[PDB]
Structure formats: C-alpha cells, structure tokens
Amino acid sequence: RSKADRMAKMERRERNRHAKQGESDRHNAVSLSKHLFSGKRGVGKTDFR
Amino acid sequence: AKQSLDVSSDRRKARKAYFTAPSSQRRVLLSAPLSKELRAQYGIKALPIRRDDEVLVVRGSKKGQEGKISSVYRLKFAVQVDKVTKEKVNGASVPINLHPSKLVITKLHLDKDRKALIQRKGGKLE
Amino acid sequence: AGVKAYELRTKSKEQLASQLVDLKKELAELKVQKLSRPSLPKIKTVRKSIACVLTVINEQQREAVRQLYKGKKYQPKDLRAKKTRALRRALTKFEASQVTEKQRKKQIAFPQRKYAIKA
Amino acid sequence: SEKAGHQTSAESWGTGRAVARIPRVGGGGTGRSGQGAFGNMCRGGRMFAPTK
Amino acid sequence: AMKKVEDGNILVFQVSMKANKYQIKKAVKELYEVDVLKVNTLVRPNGTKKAYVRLTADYDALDIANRIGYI
Amino acid sequence: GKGTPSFGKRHNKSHTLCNRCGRRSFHVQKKTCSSCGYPAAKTRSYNWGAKAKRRHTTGTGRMRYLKHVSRRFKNGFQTGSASKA
Amino acid sequence: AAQKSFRIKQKMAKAKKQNRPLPQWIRLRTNNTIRYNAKRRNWRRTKMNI
RNA sequence: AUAUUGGCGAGAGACCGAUAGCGAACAAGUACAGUGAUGGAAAGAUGAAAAGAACUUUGAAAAGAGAGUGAAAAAGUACGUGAAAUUGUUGAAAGGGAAGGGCAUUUGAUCAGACA
RNA sequence: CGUGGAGGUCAGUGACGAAGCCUAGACCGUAAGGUCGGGUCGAACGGCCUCUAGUGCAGAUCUUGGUGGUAGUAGCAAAUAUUCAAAUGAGAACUUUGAAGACUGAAGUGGGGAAAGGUUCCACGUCAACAGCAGUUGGACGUGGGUUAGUCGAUCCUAAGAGAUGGGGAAGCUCCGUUUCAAAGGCCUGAUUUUAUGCAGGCCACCAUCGAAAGGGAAUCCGGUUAAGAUUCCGGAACCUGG
RNA sequence: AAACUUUCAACAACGGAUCUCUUGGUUCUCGCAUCGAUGAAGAACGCAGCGAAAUGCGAUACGUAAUGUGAAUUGCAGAAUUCCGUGAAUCAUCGAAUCUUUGAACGCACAUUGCGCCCCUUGGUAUUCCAGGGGGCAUGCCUGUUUGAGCGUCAUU
C-alpha cells in the first residue's frame, strides 16, 4: 500500500505545477483568440466599450 | 537465404510478432537445450522448458548454480529457478528472472505427453 | 472444478432441471457472503457451472426438434443454414445446371474433343 | 500522401497590428485553434512541393 | 437498513430492474415462505432498484434474517 | 445588452438525446435529428464531409457480426462439428 | 431538474460510477503505462451536456 | 484481356524517424469547445533485473543528512544524453550621461612549438 | 566547403569508451570549414572514388514550444464592522464554543419551488493542488451512506399547431394534404345444450396519431421519526376507481 | 574600498534542443470476394473475487459448449488436483448456443423505460376483472388457397 500510495504522489506532480485543482481540470487555453486580434477599429460602432 | 514468399525478412514484423505473441507461441520460444549427458541419453537437442524440471545456469553472474524451476514466467519471457535469489536489505527474498536459452537442463520431469514428444522428435528414451 | 460438460449429457431432462435449481441456491448464498467477506473467489466457479447446465439443456431440446423435422421440408428459420444473405438468395446446384432441350442435343453431338498436334 | 496537411479548415483573419496573415484554425477550445496551418512553414502543415 | 428490520418489520433487498411490485411480492413469498403485507420500491442513484418489503404481523423479520444469514 | 447580460437568458434546450445516434442533436420542434438524419430512413452523410464519415463508418463500432464473416469464409461456411481425431 | 426523465437519470448513474480515481493495484502491474484517470469529470469544472 | 486512395490476407522500399510521418507510435477521432452542422489537440525513452533506498538521526510533516542496493544515483518513478535564451554562488576585471567594434603596443593571466 | 540517405573501398575506428554536448587550451585554410587535447556521457561512426535529394537561415507584423527586461512594481479600496478569553493544533486577524458589538428589517442577506445543474445533500478520514492573504475549515480531495406513494405529478384530453394512410406531383432525396375523387369499421342481446357461437339484425357513419410536469383533470390529512428522506416510511383516522 | 552594472569560466539551476533509438505512418506490388427481415452498420445501458478506460462480451455477459496443444495464470489473493491426464490457460482454433433495450425497425407510440388487441397456460370463490409465464399482431408486391363484390355478362329455372 505504501508502495502504491507513494505512486499516487509521484504521478500527481505534473498537474500540480500547472496548478490544476483536480485530476479533472482539463480547461484548455486557446492559443490566439479571434476577437482580440482580428479587427480594424475606426469611426463608427466599435467592438467593445 | 530466404527462398519463400510467405516468410518475412522484415525487422519491424519480427519484433512485433515476438512482443505480441500469445502464450502457446511463447511456450516454443521459451525452450532450453539439454546437457551433453542427456543429449547422448535421449538423442534430442532442445526441449521447451517445464515447471518441474531441474536445470543448471551456464551463462551470467549466477553461473555454476543449479536448482529446480519454480515457475515459467511466460509474460516476462523468463524463468524463476528456485534457490537463485537476491535477498533485499530488509531480509526479504526476491527471485531473479532468467532467460531459458541460457539454461542447460540436467534432469527432466517426465509425464506421459513428454514421452510422446521424445518419441516424436526421434528419441530413444528407454 | 464445477460441473463437467460430458457428465451432464448422460443425465436425463428431469435431472438437468433439478441440477440447476440447486446451483442457483448456492449462487444466492455466495452473493450474501460477498459483502461480509472482502474477497470471495469461489463465486466464479459456481457462476460458470450454471451456464454449463443451460448450454446442455438448450442442446437436448434443439436436437429433439431437428429429428422431429428430419426428412420433411420447411424446417424453421433458425434451424436452417445460416450461410449468408446473398448466397441463400441464389440459384441452387440443380437450377443453374438446368439447360434447355436444344443445347442438350448439341452437347451430346459435339463435345470439346481432346486432341494434340505432334504427328 | 496527397491529402496530408489539408485535413484542416483554416481561414485567415485579416490585417491587424499584432498578428500575421497565415490562415488559422477556426473554432475555439482545443489549443490547436488559433495556430497556423496550410503553409510549408507551419507546424502541422504540408511540405513544399509534395513528392509525387 | 438494520434499523428498518427491527422497528418497521421491513426487509430491504436489491432487485433486478425489470421487476415490478407484483413479481417481487410473488418471489419473496416463494423463496422464504413468508407472506408480504406491502412492497415499496425505489431506484437508487447508482442505477439499481431497492425494495422495502414489509412482512405481515404474523411473521417476524428477525427470524428470517438468521436463515439467510445477514444480520 | 447584446453581450453578457443577454447570456443569462439562455435556459431552454433546443436539442435533446437522439434515439439512433445518441449524439444530443435531436431538434425538438422540428422532430428530426441534425447529425444522423432520424426519423428518415437513411443515415445523413455527405461527400463534402470527409471527417463526417470517418467518425461513423464501419470499424469504429463493435462489429458484432462482421468480425466473424472473414473467418467463416476462410473455412468455407461449414456445418457439423469436429471429429475428435 | 428534480422532475427528470429516466433516460436523463440513467446517464447520471453512469457518470456517477465513473467519478472515481484509478485503483491502487493497477500501479503494480507489469508494463503499466496508465498513471491517472485521464477521463475524470467534475460537476464544477465541466458540464457533461446531458 | 482491362479498372480499384474501400474490405481481407501477404510481401517489399536509394521514403519519414516523435514540431517529421496519417489528425492519431501512448486509454485518438480520445480530452476539449459550440444550441447544432461541425471543429478538434497536447502526450514515446530509468536500468540488464526494481535490487523503487531497510535501518540511523534532526523536523509536526514534506524533505534533509548518513547508511544502503547497482557497473553508474553525474540513472531516484521530476527518472538516457540534458544545448541556448535566462538565473544563482565563487573567482578574476572594468566603470564621471550607454555598451560593444577596427588598427598598434604596454600590463596581468595563459599556452603549444624547440635546440639534444 | 558543409548535411541526410545509396553502390564501392580502406579485411577503416570502437564498452580499455562510438556519436552528442561544453571548453578567453593547441594547429591548419584568405574563407565556407577541417583536425587535436581536456571535461561530460554510454553504443555505434568515419576517410576517399562516385550516386541521389524534403541539403545550409537572423529577418517573412514568419510557425510551434520556451525565457526575460519592465517588477517584488501596478495592484488586491462599492455592498457601514468587528472585538476578548478558552478548547483544537507544529502553527490561528480567518476554524469551533461562550461572552460582546452591529447589519439585512416581511418588494429580506428569511421560508419553499419552475427552467437549468447532477450528487454539490450527510457522516468518517484528511490538506500536495484550488479557495488571487491565510487555513486546523469548505461547494476541494479519499471512502462510504442517503431519495420508498391507489390519493402529489407524469401517464389521459384538446388549444395554436405538427403528421402518417387513400391518392395526386417530383429525374429524384421526397413535397402537397388531413376528411380528402377510398369498397377505410365495430358492438350487442340472443336462438344456447355437437358448444362452439352459427345465425336471428339491429343500431353507428363519427374514419390514425402526436401536442400543456402553469390550461381541463376520479380520490389524504394531522401527529411522530433520521447524521441525510416524506401529503410517500410508523401510529391513528378517511375517501376513490375497477371488480 | 564594497555594493551595484556588464563580460567570461567552473559547479548548480530554469528548459527539453541535439545524438542514438522504435510494437506507428507512408508508397508500390501480389492474391482474394464474404454485410442485411435467419434482424446488419451504428447507438445506449450493463458484466470481472479486487477496473475508472482501452479490449472482450450480453442476465449463459473479460464468456459457455466443440476441437487442438499438454501445465499454468500473475499486481495481490484464492483453488490444489486441474498434474502418467476426457486436462491448466486472458492460449490457439471455431462448425454448436446465448445474444438486454434499440436501430432499415416491423402491434400503435416516443422529450413517455407510455399504451393496446389475440392464442395457449398458472394463481386469485372467474368466457367478461386483475396478475404471472410462453408464442404472436407492420407496409408494398408476387404465385396459390379461401370467403366474397358488380343488370360487366352467359346459360338456365
């Protein structure tokens, strides 16, 4: 069991460095979001406040 | 060399056929040769290893030690000879896995089906 | 262990029925002991023994019906050959080998003669 | 392969101050979305002059 | 569940999904030779069916629990 | 008013579980399934969707029947049993 | 929604029984490449979409 | 006779060798996003064998320090080789509103060749 | 001159250390570059004569991955507010109990529900990660426990509307249409004594089905009880439909 | 003079390039013809002594019967006859069976685990009411049977 319980701690490390709050946090970061960078904003109605 | 069309000479085929072979085909691969005592006796070079045979290691650090097989561990392509172990630091004992091509059989454990196998491959047995 | 295949085939229909109910009384009891004990490996063997009885009882009832319809046309659909769909919907060996009466006079008259060119 | 590299549905975004002109993978949420494709320089893109 | 054996005179079983209140009432009356006053059933959240089986007043649930074994 | 305050109003499901493909693509008011074409007789597929086919062709499932046909052919669709030689 | 259909409920029961970590003894097998339950779900993080 | 980027069983390559090669060498059309049509990744390598570090001693513990297994822990489940950006410590050196470069020599440090 | 593979050749080098990497140590070539020593590491790699190409990068607002300066800085300031002892603990501005101080003030920071979420509900253990400070605590993590119905709902009916069949269009996937140019289908008693229902013979013309957990609608209330459940279990007392 | 800034080496970091690997891909050749109303392809839920997934399978549920080989399986347990043999195994082969709820989907119906009718049979003082068990009830078309329909029409009484 202590052989098996230490293998839970060995396999947990990679998710802790990425600050995953579980073994079930698989929220994926989009590399480049479309609304941030694709636009040209001139006189008129604009894309935000 | 190769003179047939069904046989393969490809490296990627031969490893994959080895690593995913089922247990009945692992039996023929885990075979051990007989000693020059028994080769003169029965008249047969090699046999598949069995659980209850007696054997002598001939290559490795454990050369010169002999003992009965405990169990043929086909899933690791290995054999665990009894009385050949490493004791751990805490007194516990761990068997050492051996490959049976480096073994030499000195005594055979004969069943009915092993006799007919010796008859099949040309043996004299008695 | 458990029950054997060939031993149950010699038994009768009344005994293969009473074999099975006594097995299911055991499998009821071993599911009770499964919660008290942590691990109970015996319950595998009594489970396959119930399946070995049901194969033999099904077989003796099916080989009865085959000899019931033996030598009589229109046996039921699960008892026929399974072969495949497109081969059951096809011409039989008699019907494809049928040939009209005009050809049959011709093949008698002029078969492919066997010859050779050497001399 | 004749279709290797073209199993993507990218489209270019336009001309901004802070981004290039390569067609990018549409949609969002996987991490492949927003990466370059269909170019010889892109990761996961086809090569130049596919050998026939 | 063992609280419900003593006070309410109620046995608790896990039952196959396809059964209804008529078939459970017939099966318990067959296996155990015990009359049933009323059966109440629920589906568990893990996907199996529970069944609260209240016996009659003539029959005691403590004595049947020794024969099957659980207590 | 069109951005984040109107996203609070989204709580009526358009689509539900389909009976055929299990896909959650069954439009309720249309009473049809957008992914697998149900209740029409044929499975919805198109040649413009190349990746649409590879998710649902044969081989991706269990193949309860087709995994035995190549074996039953190789023997030759035989009956009876083995003779215990 | 506490007035649920059975088909909705039966998919909750399957998601409930998959909500577990990996067993400890599978760490000990031969040629174990499997480390963590990489399909682990949570009600807070990801909605399971019916 | 002829057609075949599908199915099934075979044999081969002056092809690619983990950002390459199919999207997928691994629980891959998986995880994940969208109401939906559809979109759609990342992720191979301890060693011959786990022999995966008993015990001792500090600390609440994680861990450290010794011991110890092994040919090697400069292979310790962050595991073969571990480059550069970037950072730490020691040592040398310079520095009045940038630094670095070119030609020539001093100064300090440093270094092979060579007479028999 | 250099790199990846190919045919030759040196019976080329190699676990006594092959490639790779580091090296203000040495030499050669004007240069692309080549050779040697030292340190690291552990298993294959060169010279020459030719052959072949997915063959040389600093730039493309290049592509994927990685790391900095800025910087221990901007910031962590709406919703009036916290304080003292004790226990628990290696540890307390933040956890638990008691004593104080306040606030939401019945169109509430209260008591339940519909969509929606799916075990968050409760207990036992317990803190590497998350809770932008902290943590002994949690909607976290680990293991288990927990939803009981003749009367509450669904199920039944129809609304706006969806939609088969008879048919007619359409090359065709399928579109029209809902009582339409259709031969569209059931129920009652008998006369019963082979027992099954012949038949006495009538009446009816309405002609799928889906559509409301807020409309229409057969019938239940109090008191107890659990770590978590109730108009559902227990005790007591009533009503309804089919028989 | 330190500190600080910058350059360089040593050792240590951050990071995963290089070299060496390989159960995968790619391309060419060679042979072969075999899905389904006897219920397929797909889908949902279930099953292991200890499994979440892949893989396997269907209430006979990581399988059963048949055949071959002839002693394992393995992470722990367990069982010891199952070891000179009608016999181990996650073996191989495969000709006999099972095959939940679905799906062309087939009694009507579906956002309902909704609702009928028929036959045989068992239990409730039961041809009618309720329940349990087994087998049934789609449409288009063909050949044939059986009962019919129409001054469409022929003899006849």
Coordinates of C-alpha atoms in Angstrom, one line a residue, chain F residues 24 26-28 30 35 37-38 42 52 57 59 63:
Chain F
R24 CA -27.5 15.0 -28.5
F26 CA -32.3 16.0 -31.8
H27 CA -34.1 19.2 -32.6
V28 CA -37.4 19.1 -30.6
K30 CA -38.5 20.0 -36.0
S35 CA -26.5 14.7 -37.0
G37 CA -31.0 12.2 -40.1
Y38 CA -33.5 10.4 -37.9
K42 CA -31.2 6.8 -44.3
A52 CA -18.0 13.4 -41.1
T57 CA -18.2 4.4 -40.7
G59 CA -14.9 -0.3 -37.9
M63 CA -18.9 -5.0 -35.3

